[PDB]
């Protein structure tokens, strides 16, 4: 009747999947769980018809999905965006994982009681990872050349988070600073970011030391 | 000249990729880094021709890969094992991620100074995740029906690790206990496990609290 996507009303793990959607102009509704609704999830968690219950979920009627990365890859696969030959898939997946080292690097520490000191060790390695992305862009509009691919949205999302973490981490990465602006200047994403549908905060689950609250 | 796969001489993140290989009878050589060889990696790390240097790496000459999950998906894609329609990819990827919640659950805590207490909270949630896998198998030889898929090897690997963690965690999961035996009873894997080529330990990087040492 119309694709469903369920998650907490935070950016978290599905923010990118949201942006891919907006970029594709796919129609979808959203089940959004408020912080105060742990019980509500707990019940609809057990009955939606999933074999690996979890959040986020994505229901096409055609399918019932539960893993964050499958859900986004499945959207891209619906639109023939995962790659033609293997060398292509494989490489998209590489960008994928490389962007996940950054986004998970953040997530891994955000809910710990030692965040501020774990912080110092992440921003240290970050540049290193940041750079690979900069060099990758010395010659390609987007992460995989001309045509947008889902990790361009992963990558977007990751810069957005690290910037709240250290506003300057992209001083020294002009190429990355233009990519974040570019993705922004794309009409569909342009609209979504100023739409009512946009969720600007929290970055992580609310309880989180970093990116928590309101 | 012959596919290369490089990693530390531990099971770690590539053990499953190794098992897929052995199951496919693909020929490959291995660059194995001993614990004492951090400097050696550090030099060959910078020159192999990778845009996202890292371990593991997989060099087909046809391609130069670096993310653990892409490398294994790329092997499966070489053999037409990632799925026919999208509903297929998507679902394989689901098994994928669901098995990664378990394997990363372990990895996330193994190198921490509070392991033993973090331990207690993992084995708690484990059953929950374990079960999804058991129910998934009430009616399918393998994780995706009759034909073996790469998460069957991920899943294998994950049971192997958690068993060193708690030898009984599979009492209560007879269906899972037969799957671990089955995968074992497959001639190719049968051979590899008793071959010289097999790496039985360490589970994690050597420095690790859990699964470290020799
Ligand atoms: N690996 C999974 C992780 C899922 C996950 O950790 N979900 C959390 C939110 S960050 C959820 O609260 N779990 C809901 C539940 O377990 O019922 C994915 O990529 O989707
Ligand atoms: N997300 C990456 C993680 C890679 C990774 O963490 N590799 C560690 C071993 S567990 C390696 O020592 N990094 C080597 C390096 O950074 O040079 C993957 O899936 O391959």
Curated annotation (Swiss-Prot), chains A, B:
Reactions catalysed according to its record: RX + glutathione = an S-substituted glutathione + a halide anion + H(+)
GO molecular function: glutathione transferase activity
Positions contributing to glutathione binding: 7-8, 41-45, 54-55, 67-68
Xref: InterPro entries: Glutathione-S-Trfase_C-like, Glutathione-S-Trfase_C_sf, Glutathione_S-Trfase, Glutathione_S-Trfase_N, GST_C, GST_superfamily, Thioredoxin-like_sf
Known function: Conjugation of reduced glutathione to a wide number of exogenous and endogenous hydrophobic electrophiles. GST isoenzymes appear to play a central role in the parasite detoxification system. Other functions are also suspected including a role in increasing the solubility of haematin in the parasite gut.
Residues in GST N-terminal domain copies: 2-83
Boundaries of every GST C-terminal domain copy: 85-203
Subunit structure: Homodimer.
Organism expressing this protein natively: Schistosoma japonicum (Blood fluke)
Lineage, opening ranks: Eukaryota, Metazoa, Spiralia, Lophotrochozoa, Platyhelminthes
Stated name of the protein: Glutathione S-transferase class-mu 26 kDa isozyme
Annotated EC: 2.5.1.18
Keyword Repeat listed: no
């Amino acid at each position: 009747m119309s694709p469903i996507l369920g998650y907490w009303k935070i950016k978290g793990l599905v923010q990118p999947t949201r942006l891919l959607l907006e970029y594709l102009e796919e129609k979808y509704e959203e089940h959004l769980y408020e912080r105060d609704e742990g019980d509500k999830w707990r019940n609809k968690k057990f009955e939606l018809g999933h074999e690996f219950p979890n959040l986020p979920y994505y229901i096409d009627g055609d399918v019932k999905l539960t893993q964050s990365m499958a859900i986004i890859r499945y959207i891209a696969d619906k639109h023939n965006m995962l790659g033609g030959c293997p060398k292509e898939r494989a490489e998209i997946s590489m960008l994928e994982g490389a962007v996940l080292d950054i986004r998970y690097g953040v997530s891994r520490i955000a809910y710990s009681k030692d965040f501020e000191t774990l912080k110092v060790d992440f921003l240290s390695k970050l540049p290193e990872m940041l750079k690979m992305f900069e060099d990758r862009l010395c010659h390609k509009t987007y992460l995989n050349g001309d045509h947008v691919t889902h990790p361009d949205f992963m990558l977007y999302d990751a810069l957005d988070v690290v910037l709240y973490m250290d506003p300057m981490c992209l001083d020294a990465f002009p190429k990355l600073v233009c990519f974040k602006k570019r993705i922004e200047a794309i009409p569909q994403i342009d609209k979504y970011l100023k739409s009512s549908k946009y969720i600007a905060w929290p970055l992580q689950g609310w309880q989180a030391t970093f990116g928590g609250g309101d």
